[model samples]
Target: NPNYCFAGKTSSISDLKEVPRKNITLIRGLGAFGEVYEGQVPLQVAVKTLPEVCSEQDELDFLMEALIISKFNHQNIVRCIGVSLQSLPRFILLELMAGGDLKSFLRETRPRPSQPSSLAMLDLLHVARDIACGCQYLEENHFIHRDIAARNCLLTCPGPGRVAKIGDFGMARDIYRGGCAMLPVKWMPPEAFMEGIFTSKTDTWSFGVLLWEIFSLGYMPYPSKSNQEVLEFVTSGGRMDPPKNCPGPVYRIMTQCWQHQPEDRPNFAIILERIEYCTQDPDVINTALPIE
Candidate 1:
């Protein structure tokens, strides 16, 4: 378990001095961690804490987030520098992402909300490739990102050629756990929705949905389908059609992720290879690759 740790402790990190809870600027529209803050120490960092929940569940989540990111050492995954576990109002300190989340970034950067993304197909493909690379690293090191969607992907810079990194492992699970399951129905494959069954393959299934999110520029998958309808649709072997203008090769990857049996889905490693092949075309080099 090179990247797994059970102790869930971080207070011993004396070199990383404790943070004073001041000058915290709120980052809105981020997910369930209550509030995200922008802070400046020697350098900019993002501080996230469960300020609204003082319950037992909140404490448990705090531990999971802190302990999980402690061992992570990657360019594509968010870096966890230290934690304030022994004190009240514990917080997880992370390297700040200047560019922000993939979903909102895509929508804001799109020339028109209703139109195809103005970002070159190659740039989006690179985003997808970066995510797959991160996922492959996690899987190889025995972790499963229960949530692997556009919203969880972070950009390292603000414009074109910006690198993407996977973040938000708050829902990730230990591979040894086999199936400590959670569901985002829109992203689940049939078996994961019907049963609590989850695995690396389930993450692969979500990656398929993620590609849809990227190509659609954050458009909701099955936007018209309700929770129950989504279950029935996937359960009946129905899958989303590739978004308009999605390249043939790229859309093929989506179809593979929607395969009926999880085992049939291409592993993230294979997906990464195919994505590299798809973006190597000289034609993609001639297109506009603007970013926000």
Candidate 2:
């Protein structure tokens, strides 16, 4: 016999609709953050509803971080359209990026035209410049983006010249205001991994890893290495070498950014300047031949 209690409470799309079905239309899934739906306003939006199994702190953190990220208004950063917190588990509304995250996009279209000799170098230079600008803004405000990865950077739209908007603030923090260095071991810097402390320099370390991801066309950092192994590799004074496809200038800059000494790493402003210079001069940017 079927259990009526559990059967009646089976959750589905229809169960969460406080308004008429005609008013809200479903859209394709938008990554794992949450489900995306088309609102009555005819604008595509993402609804990040709190998971049913989430704790109170988790829900609070989501809303609080959303609020902080929403306050930021920049061309290279994604803007939050609206937020719905009336229900028990709150939800946030964010602008829709026609082009998904860089990771999945690269996977689906392997050997991306944007890598090595492709126009992708130009495109990603612009993207990285924007992200660095955004990061500079955050650092100026005393915040640290603990999780800086390819997946966190989204494309505003799909085109040869589309803007990249940085999103996902779950791991963001106001270093001047608080202390929370709970970053992942793989992407974390030696200082954070060894001392459990996070600062703007640590963020720069993560940024270097992000640069590797972009240059390698979404290749995983420290490939084939477990999390513990990666930590050991980084802690033992090992630094990531620039991908073969990465331009020499950019590679040199990334190497400095990943310097073992946090103080030795270049700041975001310096990084932006070097990237801009590379974009303006192709000879300065190296290219790798596509593998046959």
Candidate 3:
């Protein structure tokens, strides 16, 4: 086949310009990339690159992620602005999510005993809905995003109009490779980790865990369990308890995602509908279970 390149988006190394070293900031340590930096192609962007001296495999993976991201075009999905692959220190330019990842954002805005949550319950609902919309798009495209978690979701900014966009297409294997021990075991479903069987339903299960992370204010799944313990727990029919002060309807959705049989789980399309329907109901989005 011909070389992979985004028609108008792909840029040569000359076109890519890094922000000044004085102003450079490490956005986050993404899955495969060593670091993501706030960069520019004359436009603010997130630049992902591998170590200076990396294996060809790393380069391949880096390119693969960029290619997969370029395949999607949804408001709820992060955009691939372009890639700088004409030379060394190759870069994958992405839309900059100013507020950072959802996991950190949730922790930063967590409710305090003396002060209420800066992150409104409705805002969290919207973020979840946004992610569901992205997932639905992926499902319709027949893409299986093996990794779906709060940490993988990016946020635009910290205001009322904050948007959640799903990033990290590292696991969306149209034709990619992987590892096992490094898997996010806590977020994986019984079949995914145990048999290496991945499907959209497995992603649905991870989305439930992602929802739990959002409601629990970024707490890790299964609070006190080790990866091995989580494996046993999930296989033994153990599901996470509702996050404190979680909305009843939302908790029900989480449980549905964790169903023992993948077939029993609702697809992203159904999940998106239920979330949108719940959004219209004041009681569903406005009320939370009592703190016990």
Candidate 4:
């Protein structure tokens, strides 16, 4: 029998009696293993904790995920500060993200008198480029982020003009590894569902859905559609329509990301370049009319 299983990081479970947790209302930024909380052991930082009692296998799996993430050093990727492995409830500390997850952040784009969306169109483009840069790093390192979506991306700052970083590596894996894997159907490509295919290209497909999330203000990719329908639709080369007011060039880039053959999808570098072009050339976003 031959099968290869690898690693990822998960936060531990514990109480912070001394530190006041911020953004209690924003508990939605999370994973299967833990929930994110704001903590100030001295300075504010995000802490993730897994509280349920677990077997040895569970502990090992969680630590592996935490350790791997603790080693990552990138502006676009969340950084792990330390781990409390022996504590009653183990926990992993991460940099604080004031802006919360990109999913909710995008939905909060209204510039109300009390709070303005720091992320304007250009800012949103920058966020796209930032996430592309992060995923490109993972791809170059021969890793595949099996889950790349709005929910997994976080804003470095909650206010206007903050940076975005990719978080939640719970579903990440080595690209070269084999065997089929169950995946998020809404974000996954046809190959992933049809053949249990997993690759950086499949991640590219998810990124396309992410773009839809960005433009649609966090709307799910296929609203009112079941996962089975999504599979059949994508298998038949059906793609989601462009989000309302999505720029033509941007939508075109997203379509390229969903090409039926994984080989046909553009590389992250190409994706980054396209984003940059849109950033430098104002008309790309300004002049283009939304798809009808």
Name the candidate that leads on TM-score.
3
lDDT per residue (tens digit) for residues 111-216 in model 1: 5545445577777888988889888988887676777888888898768769899878766633322232345788888877677687889889999999999887
Leading candidate by lDDT: 3
Model 3: lDDT to the true structure: 0.78
Residue-pair clashes per prediction, in order, are 0, 1, 0, 11
For residues 1-292, could you state the per-residue lDDT of candidate 4 as single tens digits?
1123323432223321222233222234444545667765555667787666777756655666665676566789997766655554666778888888899887766435554433456767878998999989888876788889998999987665688999887666233222333457889998787777788998899998998888776788888888888889888988999877777888998999999999999989999999898778777555432222
lDDT of 3 by residue, 1-292 (tens): 1234342354323333333443333444444447788875547779787677888777767666766677677999998877766545677778998888899988877766644646667788899999999988878776778879988899988777889999777666434454556778999999987888888898899999999998887889999999999999999999999998887888999999999899999999889887887778888767643321
Worst 10 residues of 3 by lDDT: 1-10
Candidate 2 per-residue lDDT over residues 147-243, each given as its tens digit: 8888888877666666777877766633212233344666789888678788888878888888887777678988888778888888888877777
**With candidate 4 superimposed using the best TM-score fit, by how many Å does residue 108's alpha carbon deviate from the native?**
2.1
lDDT of 2: 0.67
- Better model by lDDT: candidate 1 vs candidate 3: 3
Please report, in order, the local distance difference test score of every candidate based on alpha carbons.
0.74, 0.67, 0.78, 0.74
| Cα RMSD for predicted model 2 | 9.3
Give Cα distance to truth, residue 84, candidate 1, Å: 2.6
